[PDB]
Symmetry: none
Subunit: 419 residues, 4 copies
């Protein structure tokens, strides 16, 4: 079981290059199934899910190769079924369904053994495909969709806001006959990125990033070169790393505009921030951060994905600050871990009241949440002494070699083994 | 476009005989598709939906006759499809699905068109059936279900309480192989009645009325005689009629136990109430009702179907009353209509603050909801002058000759045809 | 009982000069109680609530005179009580409490007979004052606040975002000794305006408009001249008027920045929009608006106060649009009135599914809500025939002579006295 | 720092005598302040809060002593104030307030400060009292209540269901002039017990246990002997200890009727349960438990206080089961500890997905929650090996000598005196 052994305190400063967003790379990789011609996908991070997707794609008869880029040749897809062994570790695999049916007339995706019926994950996807004219075949453990000729554009009202189903519906709609309208579409920057990718292939989409996405179907999608957008959360994590260590950092390959709320929040903490079209700088001037008030909410408001990081900021800031999770429940599992590191906090209902302390103390900590986990690693960086973060495979799944990035920032960090 | 012209004030007093519950008769009529031997369903009301169901049954090859009872012989079911023409005006038609697949191995029901995905009623039916081993197809405007051989008992956890899917799952499970357990089952008296009916046929069911129903599959269901339970909302509607008019009333062919919360509310309003095995008496002793606080919630608690009726009550009651709706959104349409009759109230969020007035005044009113509509008719009876309740077809569909029942109570009411 | 007789259809086009916001004028008027030197408040609308506030102020011993401006001389305040009548027709009256205590050491405002313990508007104000060092005295219908000397700055965390309490705490905090931090402060443009007014008097306030307001108390506030900000919702009502009428309009005395979400929403409807330092232009180019998807949420997202207006827009737009209310409950009560005008709509849960039709048919209509009411007048302007909007006094409360404005835009409208 | 050491696995069987409910004892000791004659309170557990209450009472001038009983003589009560030195460590202190002002005409309770306002516990108590005619005086750090003569009966609508405020209102109302009615009253067995205590003193109360309590005020309360009801949660914890271990336990000095939901759930898990007037027997027959579906809700529904206990049950039961928590927000702290013990569980939103493993592994654990902690100790009992549960002082505060009880059941437990 891999662990991170950090030795602090250390000032995090310098430069970091931001990896592509896993959350944009995935839907785009599945969308490449629509491409009749070779496709080059740039800025694709080296992550477990990316590997799983490549295998899945190959299993369908797609020609796949990688490095920074992922080269895809789907001119000839022959197998329209995603098997159990291949979708078992990845829910995103459902993304193969829509492209398959829209372009080939048929698709089949294996489903896991479940328990409760009603409002499940796959649900929105299946019904979205059904509104598009797909015939659905359901049997415990799998979903099959098929259509005679082209899908038919339709007017769709989403009762629930779903990032997943929005990608599925928007993807399959690019080849449908007519216009498709999606009401209550997820607004995430990743949805915008996926739509832009499609448009680069010849798709006709508008409204991406708003509550209403409109798609005019076209006969076919071509090929090309496409650059995946920067990882916005990864970027936020690095900004916070400098903000909590009285450091100065510059983020390369970033996209300032996917972070309005986070940047504004950082300024409130007294951070000196600068942006360029593709870069972001943060300077504390050796100064300790000021506590802030945070209310997480749906994009483009302050993201829940930055929550753990900001809680950390408040925990070592000057003063008292409160963090409120307005949509999500039980998002504070990790606070007791920080408290064990010498933090002063109180979890109350859907909030965390933060009392800033001068210095943290290393400890043996652990968290299952990717973000919370990453925050523990940041804590280890500035705490007095030795910190050991257990089960970092969580971090490995969403961050492209964070230890190396942290090390170049001046961190004393080692990847160590353990029983 | 029928209307009720009412002239008040009139004290509502005397006797009324309660009709069988439409909502228990429907699921029961459908479940009869499982019976191998002739069956007699007693106490079935004469309502539009019953007619639509009989016709549906006839089309499936069922021999159907009616008067008070509805006679069914489904020994020779030979057709397995419920077409658009026969199910357009009736959601309940989905109930033919489970019995067909469980007994015959195949079944299909026409699905009315719709544009929203998620929250769709039929969703839970499909899922329960799939859990039981059925193959589900969403094609040709139809929802299709089939199984090779017998359904297979399963442990089903409902993500949401659904009266409809509880009935579908429960019904089909009686013929499945093995044991079926439904977690988070709807508790409604209509559900208990349907269960009791199944058992009378030879089914093995327990837990009906609680959140956990257990079904022991058997090889076949027989025939028999079964009496549909009384309409609790109808009973409550008549009780309130006397409670707001200073009257005394005896409800015949009623079932006290399905009305716990409503009876307790009536006592708080100051009503003198007595009960027997199959009757309920309410005596105002010539007195004006007292205001009460109402919080709707799932059965066995206060029913949302009695909400508009109780609002009416608070409106002519002594004091200030509070009505809180936790079940439906937008269930206050009756209020603006009532206010036009001289009532006083404020709608704040999901609650109505009632300022009881001594007397109501006649006016031209209209509500699309069944309960609110019957409430308007009641208000017409006690209001000074003439009231014209428009669009009464809503009431015709859910109440068995309400005008006749009201007249026998002392109401001055006439059905006007034209506009 | 005033009413509007409208003759349609008429293209609304031209110019309208936007009134100051009642919602910012009120808290500023109350805040003037802090000023030791005369104060000039410009751009104050002529509305009932302003009068009540004026009467209330005079009663305290304040020198008050009005026009476009309101002159206040709070140099000689001697009465410290807000009598029963003044507070009964106006919740805003609670705003006199804070300045009184903060400046004079004593204050008292009447209380309307209680309803349900816990969750009264007045409560948050009370607790905030207490946090500031004030002694509170209560009894059914009475609230006295007092302190010996200065109020004391405190760290206050709001468990409920409240526009009212934020104003109270902020206002009173300008005179306290020390720093006051308000966590979870309301973000409204009106809060920003009030804070700005305070700063113009010599107060030290930062963070206005964000989740955290920090006030540094000072010995005293002088006098000066302050211009109340433009009415954001009126501005929006006018923008919609043109947008639903194929017209072109220019809003003068406007503040584009308080309308981001509404402006971007208008662009989605197909509108051509330009903005300047103090104006906003909208041009439909003779075109019918496009159906939009709306989601009301906390400022700066889409304002629930623009809801009815947008529902109207979708009702006469090309296509279907769904308006989703995440704010209040029961916000669609006016829709039936629109249906009576020939509109096509379905109310489902917390949403309205709008099916735009080509033209509205005039009729006799009425809504109690301010916004929904104004929307009915807009409808009369574009409907074919004559429309009579009843009970327009509701409109008069938040709209400065709307009939004159509409007429100046080309509307055929008459204020018919009583009938 | 006290700790618990457990050697497992060990079948928990035999008998246990249930302690009196701390939660009933507390409000009852406070209500005794209303007694004009001596009172003997039986079956009071020996816990910290009881000691604090005793100290509090003595300081008011009450003659107090304890053993199994607590003897109260409120004849010389000459001091009407509860100082911070007491209430600081005990929230229930607010309970002295109502009896004080109701009997003596005056009462003052010290209040813990804090940043947060709105949604504060004590708010409902203040409001109820005010409804009864009391004058309220506030200042950060204290709440004072007084009245001229007797309190006055009033009709009170609880905005929210509050156990504390229900006791306060009910208690004070017993000496009020006239009739008091509490709408939306908390239903807890602890409230029923306090009402019964009051009635034995001569008060006039009814509806206790339902959502509506009626209190007819009387001149004065006498004295007597009264036995505190059994601790329902303690009994639940004991039943679970047997259910998760193939054992057979009989709970003595119990009250079956206070545990409906828990008993039904245990049967759901496959337990052979029998009950009598004052005993409860559970028999697993050496059998492992069956996973169950659990949804916490207000009494008489499933208790949140049995939550952690049931999760442990699931974690070692056959299959998958889901615990959904709707009362408290962050009540999942016990899960990560259980995982360390070899348990398979996924946390999702307000629910926990359990994966029944055959056996747990000894380990070093710690939970701050009274219930979660007790759960861990239970875990240690059946887990293979040695387990060390830290900070068992939480358990000490709510459970009367848990080790002796467990030891008598077959457990291998030792108290360890820290560091």
């Amino acid at each position: 079981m891999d662990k991170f052994r950090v030795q602090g305190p250390t000032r995090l400063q310098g430069e970091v290059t931001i990896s592509g967003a896993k959350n944009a790379a995935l839907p785009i990789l599945f969308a490449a199934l629509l491409a009749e011609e070779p496709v080059e996908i740039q800025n694709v991070p080296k992550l477990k899910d990316i590997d799983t997707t490549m295998k899945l794609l190959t299993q369908l008869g797609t020609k796949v190769e990688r490095x920074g880029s992922v080269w895809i040749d789907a001119s000839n897809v022959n197998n329209f079924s995603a098997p159990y062994d291949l979708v078992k570790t990845m829910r995103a695999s459902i993304w193969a369904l829509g492209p398959l049916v829209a372009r080939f007339g048929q698709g089949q995706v294996s489903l896991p053994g479940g328990c409760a019926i009603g409002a499940r994950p796959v649900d929105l996807h299946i019904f979205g495909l059904e509104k598009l004219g797909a015939e659905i075949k359901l049997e415990e453990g799998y979903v099959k969709a098929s259509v005679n000729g082209r899908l038919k554009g339709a007017h769709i009202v989403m009762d629930k806001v779903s990032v997943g189903a929005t990608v599925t519906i928007m993807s399959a709609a690019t080849l449908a006959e007519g216009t498709t309208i999606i009401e209550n579409a997820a607004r995430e920057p990743e949805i915008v990125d996926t739509a832009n990718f499609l448009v680069a292939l010849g798709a006709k989409i508008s409204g991406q990033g708003t509550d209403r996405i409109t798609i005019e179907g076209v006969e076919r999608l071509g090929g090309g070169v496409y650059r995946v957008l920067p990882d916005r959360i990864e970027t936020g994590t690095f900004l916070v790393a400098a903000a909590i260590s009285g450091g100065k950092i510059v983020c390369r390959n970033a996209q300032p505009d996917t972070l309005d709320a986070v940047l504004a929040k950082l300024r409130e903490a007294g951070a000196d921030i600068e942006t360029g079209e593709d870069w972001i700088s943060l300077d504390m001037h050796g100064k300790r951060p000021k506590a802030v008030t945070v209310r997480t909410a749906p994009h483009p408001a302050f993201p829940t994905d930055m929550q753990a990081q900001f809680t950390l900021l408040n925990l070592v800031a000057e003063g008292t600050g409160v963090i409120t999770e307005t949509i999500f429940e039980n998002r504070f599992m990790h606070v007791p871990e920080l408290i064990r590191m010498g933090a002063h906090a109180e979890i109350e209902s859907n909030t965390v009241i933060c009392h800033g302390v001068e210095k943290l103390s290393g400890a043996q900590v652990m968290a299952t949440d990717l973000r919370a986990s990453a925050s523990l690693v940041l804590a280890g960086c500035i705490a007095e002494g030795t910190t050991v973060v257990d089960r970092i495979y969580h971090i490995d799944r969403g961050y492209e070699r964070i230890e190396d990035k942290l090390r170049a920032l001046g961190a004393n960090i080692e990847r160590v083994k353990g029983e």
